[PDB]
Amino acid sequence: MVNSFSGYLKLTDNVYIKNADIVEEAKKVKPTVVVNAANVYLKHGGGVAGALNKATNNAMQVESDDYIATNGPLKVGGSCVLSGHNLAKHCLHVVGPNVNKGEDIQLLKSAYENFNQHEVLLAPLLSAGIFGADPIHSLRVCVDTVRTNVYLAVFDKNLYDKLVSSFL
Helix, strand or coil, X not given: CCCCCCCCEECCCCEEEEECCHHHHHHHHCXXXXXXXXXXXXXXXXXXXXXXXXXXXXXXXXXXXXXXXHHCCCCCCCEEEEECXXXXXXXXXXXXXXXXXXXXXXXXXXXXXXXXXXXXXXECCCCCHHHCXXXXXXXXXXXXXXXXXXXXXXXXXHHXXXXXXXXX
């Protein structure tokens, strides 16, 4: 189906990439699904999670605290679907491994498999940024795992340029 995502470069048949702030993209597009770079406790302190939560005026955190009180922590490589608040219909909170916690990078493929439960997503690169993994490797795993239509937002221009110029 035609959609309103604009300005993306096509990497493969189903993976698209743009130098953009995921918060601003979400506000403009109002996608069905925005992906959060979550941790197992849904503590949205920094990185993408801190930015998305701030954009919701902390409503994402309040909802998340209730989710954890009822259900307990997620698994590394796991996910849950919560409200998208003012950003999207839904937020898919996905836990990539955090290398700075010693977590196993093979779980990155499991993390990306959650995307296949949604026909279209706006997402960051999983395990990138403060999660400590190599973003070039994360993009490779994304391409090789996700089969649904994923629109990747990369805020850092220098990183965006490197991801494009090194893509196989």
